[PDB]
Design an enzyme around this catalytic site. Structure first.
Site, PDB file in Angstrom:
ATOM      1  N   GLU A 272       0.782  -1.221   0.000  1.00 16.24           N
ATOM      2  CA  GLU A 272       0.000   0.000   0.000  1.00 16.24           C
ATOM      3  C   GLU A 272       0.816   1.274   0.000  1.00 16.24           C
ATOM      4  OE1 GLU A 272      -2.185  -1.900   3.249  1.00 16.24           O
ATOM      5  OE2 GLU A 272      -3.981  -1.014   2.301  1.00 16.24           O
TER       6      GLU A 272
HETATM    7  N1  PCD Z   1      10.225  -5.679   1.744  1.00 15.93           N
HETATM    8  C1  PCD Z   1       9.413  -6.311   0.903  1.00 15.93           C
HETATM    9  C2  PCD Z   1       8.027  -6.170   1.028  1.00 15.93           C
HETATM   10  C3  PCD Z   1       7.233  -6.904   0.186  1.00 15.93           C
HETATM   11  N2  PCD Z   1       7.784  -7.683  -0.782  1.00 15.93           N
HETATM   12  C4  PCD Z   1       6.876  -8.431  -1.643  1.00 15.93           C
HETATM   13  O1  PCD Z   1       5.887  -7.533  -2.115  1.00 15.93           O
HETATM   14  C5  PCD Z   1       4.579  -8.186  -2.126  1.00 15.93           C
HETATM   15  C6  PCD Z   1       3.635  -7.419  -1.250  1.00 15.93           C
HETATM   16  O2  PCD Z   1       3.969  -7.677   0.141  1.00 15.93           O
HETATM   17  P1  PCD Z   1       3.131  -7.018   1.318  1.00 15.93           P
HETATM   18  O3  PCD Z   1       3.326  -5.538   1.316  1.00 15.93           O
HETATM   19  O4  PCD Z   1       3.473  -7.771   2.542  1.00 15.93           O
HETATM   20  O5  PCD Z   1       1.617  -7.257   0.877  1.00 15.93           O
HETATM   21  P2  PCD Z   1       0.654  -8.540   1.014  1.00 15.93           P
HETATM   22  O6  PCD Z   1       0.067  -8.517   2.380  1.00 15.93           O
HETATM   23  O7  PCD Z   1       1.346  -9.743   0.489  1.00 15.93           O
HETATM   24  O8  PCD Z   1      -0.384  -8.173  -0.123  1.00 15.93           O
HETATM   25  C7  PCD Z   1      -1.478  -7.279   0.093  1.00 15.93           C
HETATM   26  C8  PCD Z   1      -1.300  -5.981  -0.687  1.00 15.93           C
HETATM   27  O9  PCD Z   1      -1.053  -6.244  -2.061  1.00 15.93           O
HETATM   28  C9  PCD Z   1      -1.237  -5.077  -2.862  1.00 15.93           C
HETATM   29  N3  PCD Z   1      -0.653  -5.271  -4.132  1.00 15.93           N
HETATM   30  C10 PCD Z   1      -1.364  -5.813  -5.136  1.00 15.93           C
HETATM   31  N4  PCD Z   1      -0.665  -6.111  -6.265  1.00 15.93           N
HETATM   32  C11 PCD Z   1      -1.308  -6.731  -7.244  1.00 15.93           C
HETATM   33  N5  PCD Z   1      -0.646  -7.142  -8.330  1.00 15.93           N
HETATM   34  N6  PCD Z   1      -2.625  -6.971  -7.179  1.00 15.93           N
HETATM   35  C12 PCD Z   1      -3.406  -6.606  -6.134  1.00 15.93           C
HETATM   36  O10 PCD Z   1      -4.647  -6.857  -6.190  1.00 15.93           O
HETATM   37  C13 PCD Z   1      -2.743  -6.039  -5.003  1.00 15.93           C
HETATM   38  N7  PCD Z   1      -3.433  -5.657  -3.843  1.00 15.93           N
HETATM   39  C14 PCD Z   1      -2.720  -4.754  -2.959  1.00 15.93           C
HETATM   40  C15 PCD Z   1      -3.293  -4.692  -1.555  1.00 15.93           C
HETATM   41  S1  PCD Z   1      -4.802  -3.908  -1.385  1.00 15.93           S
HETATM   42 MO1  PCD Z   1      -5.558  -4.227   0.876  1.00 15.93          MO
HETATM   43  O11 PCD Z   1      -6.292  -5.816   0.461  1.00 15.93           O
HETATM   44  O12 PCD Z   1      -6.810  -2.812   0.720  1.00 15.93           O
HETATM   45  O13 PCD Z   1      -5.461  -3.609   2.702  1.00 15.93           O
HETATM   46  S2  PCD Z   1      -3.038  -4.779   1.144  1.00 15.93           S
HETATM   47  C16 PCD Z   1      -2.564  -5.141  -0.483  1.00 15.93           C
HETATM   48  C17 PCD Z   1       4.831  -9.616  -1.717  1.00 15.93           C
HETATM   49  O14 PCD Z   1       5.023 -10.379  -2.899  1.00 15.93           O
HETATM   50  C18 PCD Z   1       6.089  -9.514  -0.897  1.00 15.93           C
HETATM   51  O15 PCD Z   1       6.793 -10.754  -0.832  1.00 15.93           O
HETATM   52  C19 PCD Z   1       9.164  -7.772  -0.929  1.00 15.93           C
HETATM   53  O16 PCD Z   1       9.636  -8.460  -1.851  1.00 15.93           O
HETATM   54  N8  PCD Z   1       9.967  -7.102  -0.047  1.00 15.93           N
END
Ligand code: PCD
Ligand code: PCD
Ligand SMILES: O=C(O)CCc1ccccc1
Ligand SMILES: O=C(O)CCc1ccccc1
Ligand code: FES
Ligand code: FES
Ligand code: FES
Ligand code: FES
Ligand SMILES: [Cl-]
Ligand SMILES: [Cl-]
Ligand SMILES: [Cl-]
Ligand SMILES: [Cl-]
Ligand SMILES: [Mg+2]
Ligand SMILES: [Mg+2]
Ligand SMILES: [Mg+2]
Ligand SMILES: [Mg+2]
Ligand SMILES: [Mg+2]
Ligand SMILES: [Mg+2]
Ligand SMILES: [Mg+2]
Ligand SMILES: [Mg+2]
Lengths: 907, 907
Positions: free
Chosen positions: B869
């Site tokens: 993320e």
């Molecule tokens: N230092 C480090 C860290 C990490 N990694 C790699 O990279 C991946 C990632 O890891 P992580 O951060 O522990 O994670 P996970 O628990 O396994 O998985 C879950 C994520 O995964 C992402 N990315 C992606 N890509 C793609 N191609 N498709 C998709 O659908 C998706 N979804 C998105 C979401 S939305 Mo939530 O459920 O709202 O809280 S949380 C989330 C894997 O293969 C592992 O082993 C490495 O190499 N090194």
């Protein structure tokens, strides 16, 4: 349901299955692996062989509960693919092992399993393996298959290079007469040729699957049909009956002879008033699947009044028998044969006479692929039928009036097919699928199971025969008398013609100046007659070739020498008063004689008190053609890309229509230097290919081969440049000149046999051969083993030796079955391969020997005759003659079942 | 119907089709070519790309009438197969282009078409080609795909050897930190990984296909359901309603907070009394096919009383609004944040204050694969569900009471899946398919179309936000106030938790000693909230990171330097009063600074009167974990064959659960010298894999990676020999010693945030980053182009660089969409990819730059944090800050549609 994670052809598959489902269905239907072929569905044929955890198993009898998590499966698709062929696949192609090709995936997979356990098998090890794994073939006689395995093994073993499995073009570039592989072989050995059942799985979701509601008695008046319960069942669309038929609801025999007492319109499409044989189709259930259609067909209730059935010719022919087709006598046709002088006085004054009563029965074709067809309404408004028809134009005219279409509104196409051996000279399923397509407007597909293949396709017609010879003390034949009764079942198509074959072929091979005989055709309630490879000759020549040995015995003469004395020579005529076109029988006998003498000596030396060896001889003759001035047509077309398409309707049972076309065209095109891979053939289609005629009567190489030759000669003329050389496609199109050129050929010298005398010139080319059988009889059990077969064959000139060798081996194998094991007498017991005596590999000797003694035919293309039916004309006579040599027992009524032989030994 | 003889992947196919049928259906269903992937079904995504006569076409919008006789088609199966990979396939594997893999076949086929027409493309040519052919990817940000094409082209061109497309093991044999390819890549690039729709085509004939009968209004009382016409329609088995549900017919939110005013049991499985949003499933039609089920679902009649719908948070939150869930207030949860001293007096005396009102909307996940699931009753009596669940154990407990099963009688399994981006933190189809499997006893399969994916899966929840800062003249932050209103649609699952994220992440990155704020969660009748990658941070940090630039502007300070002044350093605490675990923000800013200065200079130089360039910065922070003392478990097993299976429920959205498992285990197993290809992972399954927890909260690498590490350490101990070295499997089994060894790990230092103050230590590992966006605004149209994105990322240590690079590029691309084009506001208009503003390749710059500034985490395995993320935390803030840099316009309410920017430019 259960999840099973396994490997199929090297790829992990996350499968979701019913534990009770058959592996064959899972592979074909769920995974699309239609290279797993299904024939018998009963574990008897091997077509569905797969490797499961190192063992060769029949997928049709393997439930998913037997496939463990983590299992490894190999199908033909995992052995190799086009352009990545396995040595076994290459060897199959080189050795010509794919004729129809239906068994080829299963044999190849099975063979891979063999070689993975025994890298260097003997030929006997190979045979034992295919016996154990139930790998069945009806086309090849097995020897080419064993040859391929041995060659592949040597490559896999490093003993020869893999390049030696690739065909080497002859010095001269001539493919006529060579072992050039057939065009379809790669698709067959890779499982990538779609046969009718395969096509059914690949049709769209709208497609309705049919099941037949069939008679379960042999003869009845039908009172009514109740479909009510069936309509409530899962997946059911509708039920089709005679009320849905838009035409006459009859198939016409089309060429019914004038002196036939019946009109030829006897056979229903869907039964209306009567059941005429067990298996008759009374209704069609249409459903979303074959399984749902079949389940619902079981619930359709037919109200009928069972009638006494006549289950043999003699029974139906009795003076007081009730007419099966009211208004027509059961004995509906007779054909006299009247040659030369009255025979009675000649028999009275002859030095020696002999007589016998003989029987050949209801041989079942037993292709590995059961019958299958489909139909649909085209976007052009026509009804299209795709089936195993081997006479697409013929069948169009046989069925169109009955289904209610004009001829231009129906199109018949031959699918790739897994053998027929003649049963597809008759309509089977074509009218059924047409009626359903027309009624529903939807695509429809009908697959017979193996019991339906056995019970509800036509059969060789039994003949009850009496034949007599009169001769001089020196063995010269003076006269013959003959009587034959042909049990044609209830449907007349081609039954009169079959009866005429007895006038033509009883006693063929010899000069017989004086003949008086009579054939009769009778309707019965046993299975209807459809051509079976040899079409009258296996019956006729069994009688006369056995009777020749009886004459030799009565004279104290050697049976080969008696034949030598009488065989056709210049000046002689055949039974219909026609001069033979070539005279090769003395040559063949002279070349066989020392081998025959050596075989007699071996039989004497190797016989023991309990296992008696013998040697038997017979001659075979058959026409190449349909009777009279038969004809064909081909179109030879130069394509934009410089390839040439040779358009024909040469229907391929599996015999080699593809290679016959290519080889014949190649030879005709040699002045223009056309490579064989540039020559294309066409699958038969009544709308888009010419009326080349049916693949029956061992005719296509002669008739269509001549038409191809002429068309190609005409294309050469169309391409010839002023000053020498040939114009290219581009040069011709620039000059607005034609590129698609017709050729026709007719057997102008031929005449139909006379209705009163039987005399005429029915074929301009015949096939000639001399058989030798070597057998052992266990006199404690009556069991006969055929240890060797030899055919001296005069085929004029070979188009392709892989094709002709294979034709001969396959016919010899069918002859072993006819002699020893095969019949269709018992409707249930004979409805399986094993039950009906199918020849598995151990029944067919590895020693199948051919000697070609070719005398070019005046009228054949490049001198060729046909081959297809020659090897089944009389091998069974040679075998019975060999049993007599061995033991002193003559079997007059085929087959020579062990108990029958025992009873005769002990009498 | 028509016969068409064509070539598919080099093999002649005798096809029987409806001329109106779609090529995608023919290929997938009739021919089994499930490598042709289908996503949108509307020609917008390219997943179904095939080559037809040299052109790349979308099979889902190509009817068979457009395929001529003799056509040539190539699908991914014809490009290459495992162990016969094409250069493009090898390059995809090497460059990590298959994340989920759903788009990979289509891109590869499309790329082959490109290279067959332009052998040596520039990168821009590649991008233009994928734009023209509509090849869409939601996972990769496109850059890896272009990289792969260029590398493949060089090989095909002979400029480098093909062996260079094969991974080269590092000197040291360490795969941790490397570019080792992911185990699933070969299957993905060959089309041999079966996703849920693929599995549906490969299920047996008994399988019922479902279609949803859905609400077509946003809010209603249901009076009745009439199924009568539907039951008469083709292929229909039954219709399932709430009456068929065997349990409570409610999904539980499971961890509903005590101070939530609702009980968490608000969401129906099948609607009974009410419709709560457009799309709610009221009934399921069961039929023989998806098409027949859908046709019949159209005929089910629902009688309802439409009610006024509340289509935004503010509307539903009004004091007098009618309760959507009678008995629960629409505003069902509040979370205060109370850190340090009262903020009012601090704002009053501060040198500078700023405030803003911001909005982030209902972003749609838009995976290329629409939702799909199936279920069946096992032979063991349990109900099995296979779906896109990314929390199989979580979902089991969320649905079991509602479907009426005890937990041990249900099994959930994660199928291979084509992306989720969080929507699969919620149940979608699992309870529906379970109910149908249980009611019918039959296997059932449910596939959503793309409109159902858009309308009837959960969404990022809109937040209406007000945030304020007080600061000294030198830029030191003194205090923050915050207010946020979360529109969670009608179903409460995880809505309170999402609201808590605002207490944790508004203002994250900086020392802010005094905070007073309040989040509120409100039920509405727009789409229910499901996690979307970033889960509260994209909303929170859009507000605070935009507000930081507003503060810098008011101070006359550079916005990067303002961040540098305030970024976390030792002694500081985050908004919940917790000390950061590492302090990498100053380092990242110092390393970015000269690149930022250079980008400013470039923007000034390259700006024109009409096309104004700008540069924007933001910081992102997010936790790795579920809140509190999160935990995981793994089993490390020595197999008989010497391979090691590492059993986890690490759910793979496509991010790389496979390679995360293998790489982490490889590093832990190094003392025993285990090769990476010997290490196996397990697909998630509640019956047979441990409760490793969901793939949400960027947690698996930390939690499950630590559990894998511990399990492997424990397996090493179990294998250690007295005297040194390691026992083999055979040695251990001979000693009756264990071979399958557990490991567990818990984030013991963490505490849940307090319900009154928001304070706590919710995660022990966080992810930290600094974004830079470079944009051009056309001031005549308001259109913004993102010309470059940079992420400085502190991931601790990389398990696999192909995985992490790809994660970052994909998140950046989603950030471009969030900033500029994406929403789900208009139920119909936003129900297509194009309609909802999906980013096609030209929208994503080729310049996506990563700089890793890794500070090993005390609690991460080998020092790793998560990544998933991080790249979506605030890229959209950097982009809006860049539009402001360029033009002087601030967009407060996303997305920055051209007309919106224009209106602001012209005001
Ligand atoms: N230092 C480090 C860290 C990490 N990694 C790699 O990279 C991946 C990632 O890891 P992580 O951060 O522990 O994670 P996970 O628990 O396994 O998985 C879950 C994520 O995964 C992402 N990315 C992606 N890509 C793609 N191609 N498709 C998709 O659908 C998706 N979804 C998105 C979401 S939305 Mo939530 O459920 O709202 O809280 S949380 C989330 C894997 O293969 C592992 O082993 C490495 O190499 N090194
Ligand atoms: N000389 C010569 C001759 C021949 N050939 C070849 O051989 C084949 C054959 O030919 P023919 O003889 O001409 O014939 P066709 O017409 O084509 O065909 C038919 C036949 O064929 C046979 N064979 C066979 N094989 C197989 N495999 N399969 C089958 O099924 C079968 N069938 C059978 C039958 S019976 Mo009837 O229909 O009854 O009348 S007659 C018949 C061909 O391929 C050809 O080309 C050659 O090469 N050479
Ligand atoms: O000539 C026809 O129309 C059919 C002739 C035929 C039918 C069956 C076997 C041999 C010849
Ligand atoms: O902890 C749980 O049981 C679910 C926690 C969760 C749900 C949705 C997004 C992030 C965390
Ligand atoms: S043995 Fe399986 S189909 Fe004959
Ligand atoms: S090639 Fe063996 S059954 Fe035809
Ligand atoms: S373009 Fe065909 S499935 Fe999306
Ligand atoms: S890898 Fe492209 S959509 Fe997932
Ligand atoms: Cl007898
Ligand atoms: Cl017996
Ligand atoms: Cl705004
Ligand atoms: Cl706009
Ligand atoms: Mg090889
Ligand atoms: Mg004479
Ligand atoms: Mg009997
Ligand atoms: Mg007896
Ligand atoms: Mg290659
Ligand atoms: Mg300080
Ligand atoms: Mg709008
Ligand atoms: Mg405006």
């Amino acid at each position: 349901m259960i999840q099973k994670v396994i490997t199929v052809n090297g790829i992990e598959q996350n499968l979701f299955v019913d534990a009770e489902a058959l592996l064959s269905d899972v592979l074909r239907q769920q995974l699309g692996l239609t290279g797993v072929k299904v024939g018998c569905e009963q574990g008897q044929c091997g077509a569905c062989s797969v490797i499961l955890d190192g063992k060769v198993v029949r997928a049709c009898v393997t439930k998913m509960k037997r496939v463990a998590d983590g299992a490894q499966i190999t199908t033909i698709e995992g052995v190799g693919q086009p352009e990545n062929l396995h040595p076994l696949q290459k060897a199959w192609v080189l050795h010509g092992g794919a004729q129809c090709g239906f068994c080829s995936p299963g044999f190849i997979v099975s063979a891979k399993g063999l070689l993975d356990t025994n890298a260097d098998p003997s030929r006997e090890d190979v045979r034992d393996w295919f016996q154990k794994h139930r790998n069945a073939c009806r086309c090849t006689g097995y020897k080419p298959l064993v040859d391929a395995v041995m060659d592949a093994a040597a490559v896999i073993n490093g003993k020869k290079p893999e390049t030696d499995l690739e065909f080497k073009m002859p010095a001269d570039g001539r493919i006529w007469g060579s072992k050039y592989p057939r065009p379809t072989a790669v698709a067959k050995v890779t499982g990538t040729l779609d046969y009718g059942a395969d096509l059914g799985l690949k049709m769209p979701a709208g497609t309705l699957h049919l099941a037949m509601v069939q008679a379960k008695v042999s003869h009845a008046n039908i009172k009514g049909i109740d479909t009510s319960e069936a309509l409530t069942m899962p997946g059911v669309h509708s039920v089709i009956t005679h009320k849905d038929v838009k035409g006459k609801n009859r198939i016409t025999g089309l060429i019914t002879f004038p002196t036939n007492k019946g009109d030829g319109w006897d056979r229903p499409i869907l039964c209306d008033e009567k059941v005429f044989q067990y298996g008759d189709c009374i209704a069609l259930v249409c459903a979303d699947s074959e399984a749902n259609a079949r389940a619902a067909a079981e619930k359709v209730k037919v109200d009928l009044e069972e009638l006494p059935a006549y289950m043999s010719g003699p029974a139906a022919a009795a003076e007081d028998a009730i007419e099966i087709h009211p208004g027509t006598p059961n004995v509906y046709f007779e054909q006299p044969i009247v040659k030369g002088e009255d025979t009675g006085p000649i028999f009275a004054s002859a030095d020696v006479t002999v007589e016998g009563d003989f029987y050949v029965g209801r041989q079942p074709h037993m292709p590995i692929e059961p019958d299958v067809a489909f139909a649909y309404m085209g976007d052009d408004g026509k009804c299209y039928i795709h089936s195993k028809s081997i006479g697409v134009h013929l069948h169009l005219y046989m069925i169109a009036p009955g289904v209610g279409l004009e001829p231009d509104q129906l199109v018949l196409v031959a699918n790739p097919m897994g053998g027929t051996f003649g049963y597809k000279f008759s309509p089977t399923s074509e009218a059924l699928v047409a009626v359903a397509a027309m009624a529903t407007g939807r695509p429809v597909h009908l697959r017979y199971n193996y019991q339906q293949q056995q019970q509800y396709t036509g059969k060789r017609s039994p003949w009850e025969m009496n034949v007599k010879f009169a001769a001089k003390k020196d063995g010269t034949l003076l006269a013959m008398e003959s009587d034959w009764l042909v049990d044609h079942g209830p449907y007349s198509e081609f039954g009169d013609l079959l009866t005429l074959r007895g006038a033509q072929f009883i006693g063929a091979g010899y000069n017989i100046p004086n003949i008086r005989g009579l054939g009769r055709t009778v309707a019965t309630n046993h299975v209807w007659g459809s051509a079976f490879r040899g079409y009258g000759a296996p019956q006729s020549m069994f009688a006369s070739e056995c009777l020749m040995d009886m004459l030799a015995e009565k004279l104290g003469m050697d049976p080969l020498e008696l034949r030598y004395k009488n065989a056709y020579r210049p000046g002689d005529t055949n039974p219909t008063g026609q001069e033979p076109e070539v005279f090769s029988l003395p040559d063949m006998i002279d070349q066989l004689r020392p081998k025959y003498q050596a075989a007699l000596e071996k039989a004497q030396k190797e016989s023991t008190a309990t296992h008696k060896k013998g040697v038997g001889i017979s001659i075979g003759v058959y026409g190449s053609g349909l009777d009279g001035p038969d004809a064909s047509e081909a179109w030879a077309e130069l394509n934009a890309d410089g390839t040439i398409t040779v358009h024909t309707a040469w229907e391929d049972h599996g015999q080699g229509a593809d290679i016959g076309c290519v080889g014949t065209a190649h030879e005709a095109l040699r002045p223009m230097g056309v490579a064989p891979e540039k020559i294309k053939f066409t699958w038969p289609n009544t709308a888009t290919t010419p009326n080349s005629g049916p693949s029956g009567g061992s005719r296509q190489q002669v008739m269509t081969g001549n038409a191809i030759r002429v068309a190609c000669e005409n294309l050469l003329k169309a391409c010839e440049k002023p000053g020498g050389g040939y114009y290219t496609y581009d040069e011709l199109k620039a000059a607005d000149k034609p590129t698609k050129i017709t050729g026709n050929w007719t057997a102008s010298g031929a005449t139909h046999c006379d209705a009163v005398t039987g005399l005429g010139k029915p074929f301009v080319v015949y096939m000639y051969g001399v058989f030798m059988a070597e057998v052992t009889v266990d006199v404690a059990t009556g069991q006969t083993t055929v240890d060797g077969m030899t055919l001296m064959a005069d085929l004029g000139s070979l188009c392709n030796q892989l094709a002709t060798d294979g034709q001969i081996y396959g016919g010899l194998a069918q002859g072993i079955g006819l002699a020893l094991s095969e019949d269709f007498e018992d409707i249930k017991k004979h409805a399986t391969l094993v039950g009906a005596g199918f020849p598995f590999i151990k029944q067919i000797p590895d020693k199948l020997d051919i000697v070609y003694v070719n005398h070019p035919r005046p009228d054949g293309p490049f001198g060729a005759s046909g081959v297809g039916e020659l090897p089944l004309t009389s091998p069974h006579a040679a075998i019975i003659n060999a049993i007599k040599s061995a033991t002193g027992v003559r079997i007059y009524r085929l087959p020579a079942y062990p108990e029958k032989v025992l009873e005769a030994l002990k009498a």
